[PDB]
From TrEMBL:
Organism of provenance: Acinetobacter baumannii
Keyword Hydrolase in record: yes
Domain Penicillin-binding protein transpeptidase, first and last residues per copy: 27-238
Gene: blaOXA-33
Gene Ontology molecular function: hydrolase activity; penicillin binding
Keywords: Hydrolase, Plasmid, Signal
InterPro entries: Beta-lactam/transpept-like (IPR012338), PCN-bd_Tpept (IPR001460)
Name used for this protein in its record: Beta-lactamase
NCBIfam families listed in its UniProt record: bla_class_D_main, blaOXA-24_like
Modified residues (N6-carboxylysine): K53
């Protein structure tokens, strides 16, 4: 009973309130819907930043570079945040967006196997360059918000070219919110070492009836901008649309 015009205007205002430019792609079945205050972003390329961890984890686990219970030990060197200065599993590192662990995993996989695997799943522009430990943070790997929802959709439905158990292992690392019967599985991302900076929140809502609705929020981040606006805007948009 709410007009399409009202939905579009409501979601535009969430991005306007946050004083940024962004888009949120929602996918229902085969149909893509683009909301926000910068709809042209939808098919533009950005570095994936931490959202690459989802694929890093799939690759590492398929190729036996790690197990889900293995503990990556803090080497005792100072890390960007105190929370990263501890021993953690892949799942814990995913929740904390703990790059040092994912760089270690990237190094275990190695450049040649990484380039091969990123080409095989056909992720973004598929170019990882020559540095195995930062291609997802500063380039050359780039991906569009549309490609990100499609990846989220593939993962949520076990359609990626990986074992079913690999995909289940990673999906289980991604639960970030329960909203009475609805479960939100997503990975956030913030590319700080690039201009302009890019923010991501990519995932899907699993509803009580078992239906899965993939999304990808993509916006421009500034200095002094808080990381949880990505979440605030996403939840507000999913709720506005009655998805949660
Ligand atoms: C993830 O994109 C991310 C990578 C890095 C890398 C560095 C570095 N010094 O090399 C610093 C910060 N990074 C990231 N962002 C996280 C962060 O805490 O800075 C991020 C804000 C994580 O917060 C959550 N939700 O875990 S982001 O959303 O990944």
């Amino acid at each position: 009973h709410i007009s399409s015009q009202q939905h579009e205007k409501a979601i535009k205002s969430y991005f306007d309130e946050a004083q940024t430019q962004g888009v949120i792609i929602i996918k229902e079945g085969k149909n893509l819907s683009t909301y926000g205050n910068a709809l042209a972003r939808a098919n533009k390329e950005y570095v994936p930043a931490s959202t690459f961890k989802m694929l890093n984890a799939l690759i590492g686990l398929e190729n036996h570079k790690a197990t889900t219970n293995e503990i990556f030990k803090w080497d005792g060197k100072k890390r960007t945040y105190p929370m990263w200065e501890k021993d953690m599993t892949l799942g814990e590192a995913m929740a904390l967006s703990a790059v040092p662990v994912y760089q270690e995993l990237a190094r275990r996989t190695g450049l040649e196997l990484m380039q091969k695997e990123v080409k095989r799943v056909n992720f973004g522009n598929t170019n990882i360059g020559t540095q195995v430990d930062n291609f997802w943070l500063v380039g050359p790997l780039k991906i569009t918000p549309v490609q990100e929802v499609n990846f989220a959709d593939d993962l949520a439905h076990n359609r990626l070219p990986f074992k079913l158990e690999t995909q289940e292992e990673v999906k289980k690392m991604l639960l970030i919110k329960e909203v009475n019967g609805s479960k939100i599985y997503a990975k956030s991302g913030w590319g700080m070492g690039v201009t302009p900076q890019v923010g991501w929140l990519t995932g899907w809502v699993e509803q009580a009836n078992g239906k899965k609705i993939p999304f990808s929020l993509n916006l421009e981040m500034k200095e002094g901008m808080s990381g949880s606006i990505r979440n605030e805007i996403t939840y507000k948009s999913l709720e506005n649309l009655g998805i949660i």
